[PDB]
């Protein structure tokens, strides 16, 4: 006689995430070889720690050309005591539109860990300035002038023979994992703004042009781990 069985409530259903495999309808086939072409991917995080150029809203001179959005900073000559660039950390903000960690975070739900941003100078070698960059966890208002960005967490930076300064936003948190986008902009999903100030004036000889430029990158650090995917945003196709 057959072995007695009892079918449980889960009959004939198929789960999308169901960790099992199905009988093939045609098998015992071979394939072309693989090994000749290099460059495998085991984890996309080997992918995720590549530099990526951020994207910002253009200063109030809208050029009527297509998509007036700018991957650099135009430092002004004039003395004012407000920062150059200030942007939050919510990984769906319109400053994080096409950064890699923003991009492959945009279809996942939760991450943990640090976020490197670095910045590459571009200007004439006879020009030189001092720039500090500063970060503050969420206060009530936003820290605006130099005392507020002074007390918190910063690094000053020279212009010399090199051209960059690797910076890493530290990872302070109530809970170990954090979200990727804020349905309600709470303390669990934002972590305070980031800014950089000019500390002393850009200094440069005569007959060389004004207003230098600085590019921004954004990359995953070491501890940056992802989890638990979600369905995607098809809005790129429309």
């Amino acid at each position: 006689g057959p072995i007695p069985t009892a079918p449980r409530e889960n009959s004939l259903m198929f789960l999308s995430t169901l960790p099992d495999d199905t009988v093939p309808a045609y098998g015992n086939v071979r394939t072309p070889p693989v090994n000749y072409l290099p460059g495998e991917i085991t984890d996309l995080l080997q992918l995720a720690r590549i530099p990526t150029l951020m994207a910002f809203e253009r200063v109030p001179e809208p050029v009527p050309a297509s998509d007036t959005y700018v991957p650099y900073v135009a430092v002004p000559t004039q003395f004012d005591d407000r920062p150059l660039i200030s942007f939050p950390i919510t990984l769906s903000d319109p400053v994080y539109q096409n950064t890699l960690v923003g991009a492959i975070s945009s279809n996942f739900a939760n991450y943990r860990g640090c976020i490197q941003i670095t910045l590459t100078f571009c200007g004439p070698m006879m020009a030189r300035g001092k720039f500090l960059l500063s970060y503050s966890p969420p206060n009530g208002t936003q820290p605006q002038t130099l005392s507020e960005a002074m007390q918190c967490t910063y690094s000053i930076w020279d212009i010399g023979l090199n051209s960059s300064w690797t910076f890493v936003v530290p990872y302070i948190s109530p809970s170990d994992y954090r979200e990727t986008r804020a349905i309600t902009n709470s303390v669990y999903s934002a972590d305070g703004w980031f800014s950089l100030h000019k500390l002393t004036k850009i200094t440069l000889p005569p007959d060389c042009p004004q207003s230098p430029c600085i590019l921004f990158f954004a990359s995953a650090g070491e501890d940056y781990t992802l989890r638990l995917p979600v369905d995607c945003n098809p809005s790129y196709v429309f």
Binding site: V29, I41, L44, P94, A103, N162, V168, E222, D223, L226
Partner: protein, 258 residues
């Protein structure tokens, strides 16, 4: 710090690169590419065959043609128009007029993760009828081959050939669902998501890899030809990727502003 990024290669920097503090524990591994893709996903819907089928033509087609469109599904993630491999992707937004609307398809959410240039997997075919109380039959032929279409009479009843053949069939239950996994069968080596190239040597549209694909699924009811109803019906098709690999990374689809 104080390294410069203009050498093209920079590593990552933990908290003790310039600050005081220690590096954090690794959280999870929902990142490996042969786990990330393994998700049951439908690509489209299918009008069900009920007769001697005919399949669409090559690239130009004048009016007065007789083909039965929207009955096949050339299952790839690549963009497809009228169940034959296209290169772009349509969305017919103002469909009023005459002239038949083509069957478009694309795997929407695959590209939004895809930072690759070459891909490698096996897949599975999951079918489900949307209309109630239905019983059907799915068929298949491999890539680089083509559907057989004729009919041979049995006891005054015209019965087509796609009830039988070599390549496998599958008959469902009373409103059941059919699924099986399906391996590689392609003449080329790895699936391209980007391509240069052309189909033949000269005088060809530059960009469509016509024989680096998977195959197609068609649905049909187990009935003779002369007992066919007037109401048309529909059925969807689902794919889940398996054992995947990947090579030589690339960009992502551009997000709006807008």
């Amino acid at each position: 710090s104080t390294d410069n990024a203009e050498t093209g290669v920079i590593e990552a920097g933990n908290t003790d690169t310039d600050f005081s503090g220690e590096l954090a524990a690794p959280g999870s591994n929902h990142t490996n590419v042969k786990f990330l893709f393994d998700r049951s996903r439908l690509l489209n819907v299918i009008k069900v065959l009920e007769k001697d089928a005919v399949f669409p033509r090559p690239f130009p087609t004048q009016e007065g043609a007789q083909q039965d469109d929207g009955y096949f599904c050339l299952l790839t993630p690549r963009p497809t128009v009228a169940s034959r491999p296209a290169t772009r992707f349509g969305l017919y937004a103002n469909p009023s007029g005459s002239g038949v609307l083509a069957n478009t398809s694309l795997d929407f959410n695959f590209y939004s993760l895809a930072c690759f240039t070459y891909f490698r997997s096996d897949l599975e075919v999951t079918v489900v009828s949307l209309e109630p109380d239905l019983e059907f039959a799915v068929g298949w032929f491999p890539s680089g081959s083509e559907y057989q279409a004729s009919s041979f009479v049995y006891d005054q009843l015209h019965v087509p050939f796609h009830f039988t053949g070599r390549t496998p069939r599958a008959f469902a239950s009373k409103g059941g669902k059919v699924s099986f996994v399906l391996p590689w069968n392609s003449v080329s080596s790895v699936l391209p998501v980007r391509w240069g190239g052309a189909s033949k040597l000269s005088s060809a549209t530059r960009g469509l890899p016509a024989h680096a694909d998977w195959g197609t699924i068609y649905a049909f009811v187990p009935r003779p030809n002369e007992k066919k109803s007037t109401a048309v019906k529909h059925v969807a098709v689902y794919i889940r990727y398996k054992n995947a690999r990947a090579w030589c990374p690339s960009m992502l689809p551009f997000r709006s502003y807008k």
